[PDB]
Structure 1
Amino acid sequence: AAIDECLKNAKVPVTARNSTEWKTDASPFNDRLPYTPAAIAKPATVEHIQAAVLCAAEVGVKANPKSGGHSYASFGLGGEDGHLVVELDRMYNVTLDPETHIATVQPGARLGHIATVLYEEGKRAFSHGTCPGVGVGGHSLHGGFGFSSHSHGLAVDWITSADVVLANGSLVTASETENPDLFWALRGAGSNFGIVASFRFKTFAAPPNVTSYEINLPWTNSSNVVKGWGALQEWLLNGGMPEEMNMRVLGNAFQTQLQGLYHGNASALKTAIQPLLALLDANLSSVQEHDWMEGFRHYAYSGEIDITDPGYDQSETFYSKSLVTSALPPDVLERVAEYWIETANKVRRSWYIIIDMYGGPNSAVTRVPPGAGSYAFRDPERHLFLYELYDRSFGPYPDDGFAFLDGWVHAFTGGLDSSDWGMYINYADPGLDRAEAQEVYYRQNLDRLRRIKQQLDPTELFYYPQAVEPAEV
């Protein structure tokens, strides 16, 4: 087709439709949501990225970058058939400056590779998600929360600059002192404004020791959930969680527990966690001290950590939702708990809920000023919890299945004003229509995002079904 011929004349490497690598390059993380690209550009340099983008523009097809391919909605494939996919997985180099400790990171680098390089070379790190296979591209541009986030913020917070290919093939570098509107827009909604061709990340010195731990919670009836969660949110909201502690509730039908990573040794953790244990009347378990990389492997849930192989093909079949909420009124706790016990526990599929200890007075995430970036959820009291709701089938996902997580989210949102909840596009939920998605993902920052979108991508070359709409002018 015309896109193929354009790329060929432009000397852009591609994955041919009839090649073995098509299947690999085109394959979603979420097997529920395969899409067939118009074509797959396989850039080795920013020049190839520029050329691919221009080809899409000239030919008249949409284009999207695919970094790690982990979009829960397969938005790196375009979220529908027929886009040019700019597959970035051949560009995964990580360079660490020994002086400045600034890492130059190619946009197809996955988190496990980045973490390995930074640690092996200079015992450095930045704050990012768990999951070695996740691409830095989608992850860092929309937030990126992990077991260092209470201590050190989101992945997006470690970006110091980015080189970007715009919709018309122009190159720009975005930073606090250059293209500051774009730098703002990138840092929360970056899928909408161009293809980031290179990141620079600041780093922190990796702590010599981190301690993972668990606290099993007796959340087996509604009253226990309500009282437990009620205590937990009050503790968090009142500054109970120290900066070194990073923690979440993981719940499934068969067990509920807090899971933490404490940036310090086991004796320091025990002392730090005691007030919570007394409050919940609970016990610590599985206390394990680690070096930095072993801490990362602990929550990685993956054999391979330093992943760079283009054959990468981990996939699951699932539906997922997210939320960001304030503290929950007890009426909402009750509805959410009743849903958990009476509905979620009975669902005959592998589901889980994660409630991240996200905000509160000690969180690095919510110490970032409200004007710093387009990422919306920075208020230490209003943005207290981040949630992942995940509903996985082994075999085809049932078409009536969505009502399960949909109903659960309704139990929260029925009792919260729209100023007290949002959603998180790193757990992209294609159940939301375009209008709702923009609103819930970006909330108070949507209007400025729409203005920058009209300025940088007025033709919506980088369209996907939950992309920011250009402001009308």
Structure 2
Amino acid sequence: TTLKQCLAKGGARTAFPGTSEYSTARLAYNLRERYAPSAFVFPTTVAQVQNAVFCAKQVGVGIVPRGGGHSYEDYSLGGRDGVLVVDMEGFKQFSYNKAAKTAVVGAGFRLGPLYLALWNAGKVTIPAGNCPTVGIAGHALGGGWGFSSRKFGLVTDNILEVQLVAANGTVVTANAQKNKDLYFAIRGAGATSYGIVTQFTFRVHDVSAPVTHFKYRWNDKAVLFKNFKSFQSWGLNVPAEISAAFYMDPSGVSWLEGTYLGKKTSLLPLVKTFLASAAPNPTRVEEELNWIQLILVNWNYPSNTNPNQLNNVPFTTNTFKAKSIYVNGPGLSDAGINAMINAMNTGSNAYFIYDLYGSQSAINKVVPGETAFIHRNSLYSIQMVASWSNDNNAVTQTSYITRYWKVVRTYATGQAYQNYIDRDMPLSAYYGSSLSTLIAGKKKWDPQNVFNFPQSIPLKHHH
């Protein structure tokens, strides 16, 4: 019996090659690897997930869940041709428990709508990223750094429990008591490898007070070293109430953007040392806001925008290769900064973002060895993105960004951030000291490797 027949028993919506439903379901944030799945199935009940997992084993196809579809390597179209993609769009369950300070979120939510739901419900938030079309599933399972993360942690740190359909079909619950091994794996290594997460229970945070957004911006190739050195020096002493990220690109633009959890009249002592050592005359924008306004400002919408915009942020696409790396304190040497900026300037149509971690952050204050997310001792992470609109530049842009990564590697660590997934990173760089434990758990919960992709947790230990 075929795949069409098996999935019709479950009753979920499907889409199969050659149809227009299948063509529009192929949308992905990165359009570089236009992987062609066997079929798309759109579950709305747990049993329909169980059907898809059963049906893929019976027909002998691969299967991956898809949330928001932002995977930088297209792993949510499978990472190869001929996979059953289980698009979790129908899991939008929501509920907020004010007393427990917890929220139940379905694995098909997007960051935009989730922010709105959580604000309307009780003026609370999870510390997620700033791209509103990003699905909570991939984001939370791989880490998740946002502009409140230095106070409240990573999204992954605020997972209290998950429920997933396992490879053998059982509906499983993982939390600090039930199934600790699986609960450990999914906070950091949860993408695809251990099954299909259907819902999260998040620890949520009060953001009813006013916050302050700030951004200092330049457009001058000559001040890049100075502005970046001042960011590093400043970065080492930022208290947890600020989360900030630095931006740089080959056209000469540089900026510092951040969010202070506090009143705007308290801000200047906290950003004074950055401005003093940065170049003069920064484009200065400081604004006091409530939380939903901040989410909008952080995605280039003016603060007067209707909050309901978050339910309908347009899904945009790119075609790019992306790499990441971590940098430990006190940062890159002065030679490393020059080497980095020079490498960057040999190219164009690329951008580089530096999310601040640091020793004051909730992120680095976790006890090591209690999650699959291991990057608890860096100053910041570097996101490296090189884009193209014409396929003739794909080789030059991919070599450009890979050279850049090698230049910086001399001056930094060999770890990288798994939400900026990169097919050319060894798994040791994502999981390090916790990889053995992840592989043991992979053997236990999926011995047949039903759930795999080019960077899924393997079944074979390193000797």
TM-score computed with the length of structure 1 as normaliser? 0.90
Structure 1 residues 317, 91: CA separation in 2 closer, same or farther (over 3 Å shift)?
same
Matched, 1:256 2:245: no
- Offset at 1:354? 0.4
Q: How far did residue 26 of structure 1 move?
A: 1.9
1:327 corresponds to which residue?
Answer: 329
Distance 2:85 2:278 in 1: 49
Structural mapping, 1:354-369, within 5 Å:
354-360=353-359, 362-369=360-367
| Aligned residue among 307, 311, 315 for 2:311 | 307
Residue aligned with 2:4, SS: helix
* 1:64 equivalenced with 2:60 (yes/no): no
Corresponding position: 1:394 with 2:389: yes
Alignment match, 1:89: 89
Contact 1:133 1:307 in 2 (8 A): no
Whole-Å separation in 1 of the counterparts to 2:167 and 2:309: 34
Deviation at 1:371, TM superposition (A): 2.1
Deviation by residue 1:345-378 (Cα, 9 ceiling, x = unmatched): 34232x1100111122x10111111122101111
- The AA in structure 1 aligned to 2:55 is C
Which residue of 1 is the match for residue 406 of structure 2?
410
Map of 1:215 onto structure 2: 216
- 1:472 Cα deviation after fit: 4.5
Matches within 5 A, 1:434-453: 436-453=425-442
Secondary structure of 1:337's counterpart equals helix
1:353 aligns with 2:342: no
1:16-42 Cα distance to aligned partner (Å, 9 max, x none)? 434432222222211112111111111
Unaligned runs of 5+ in 1: none
8 Å contact from structure 1 (residues 336, 408) kept in 2: no
Task: Quote the sequence identity (%).
Answer: 28
CA distance in 1, matches of 2:206, 2:117: 13
- Structure 1 residue 458: deviation in Å? 1.9
- Alignment match, 2:238: 241
Deviation of 1:257 after TM superposition, in Å, equals: 1.2
Q: TM-score, normalised by structure 2?
A: 0.91
- Per-residue deviation, 1:463: 0.8
Give the Cα separation in 1 of the matches to 2:366 and 2:219.
34
The two structures, once aligned, show a CA RMSD in angstroms of: 2.3
Query: Which SS does the other structure have where 2:292 is aligned?
Result: helix
In structure 1, C-alpha distance between the alignment counterparts of 2:396 and 2:110, rounded to whole Å:
34
1:135-156 CA distance string (max 9 Å, x none): 0110000000011111211111
Report the equivalent of 1:168: 168
**Counterpart position of 1:426:** 419
CA 334–126 in structure 1, closer or farther in 2 if over 3 Å, else same: same
Q: CA deviation at 1:230?
A: 4.3
1:105–1:201 contact (8 Å) kept in structure 2: yes
Instruction: Please tell me whether the aligned partners of residues 230 and 274 of structure 2 are also in contact (alpha carbons under 8 angstroms).
Output: no
Give the counterpart letter for 1:208 in structure 2: A
Contact 2:10 2:47 in 1 (8 A): no
Amino acid at match of 1:71: S
> Taking structure 1 as reference, are residues 14 and 218 closer, same or farther at Cα in structure 2, changes over 3 Å only?
closer
- Report how many residues are paired: 453
- Paired residues of 1:92 and 1:308 also in contact (CA < 8 A): no
The aligned amino acid for 2:356 is M
Change (3 A) 1:21 1:59: same
Change (3 A) 1:57 1:458: same
Worse-matched range after superposition: 211-220 or 370-379:
211-220
Q: Which moved more, 1:61-70 or 1:228-237?
A: 228-237
* Equivalent residue letter for 1:143: G
- Judging changes above 3 Å, is the alpha-carbon distance between structure 1 residues 277 and 348 closer, same or farther for their aligned structure 2 residues? closer
User: How far does residue 279 in structure 1 lie from its aligned partner after superposition?
Assistant: 4.1
Residue 163 of structure 2 contacts residue 173 of structure 2 at CA under 8 Å; is this kept in 1? yes
8 Å CA contact retained: 1:188, 1:374 = yes
Task: Supply the AA of the counterpart residue of 2:244.
Answer: M
From the superposition, tell whether residues 280 and 348 of structure 1 become closer, same or farther in structure 2 (CA, over 3 Å).
closer
Shift of residue 315 of structure 1? 1.2
The separation in 2 between residues aligned to 1:305 and 1:57, in whole angstroms, is 41
Q: 1:308 to 1:156 in 2, by over 3 A?
A: farther
Counterpart CA distance in 2 for 1:60 and 1:451 is 24
User: Residues 329 and 27 from structure 1, CA distance in 2 versus in 1: closer, same or farther, beyond 3 angstroms?
Assistant: closer
Q: Please name the residue that 1:205 is paired with.
A: 206
Matched position secondary structure for 1:177: coil
Matched letter for residue 248 of structure 1: A
Check the 8 A contact 1:207/1:264 in 2, yes or no.
no
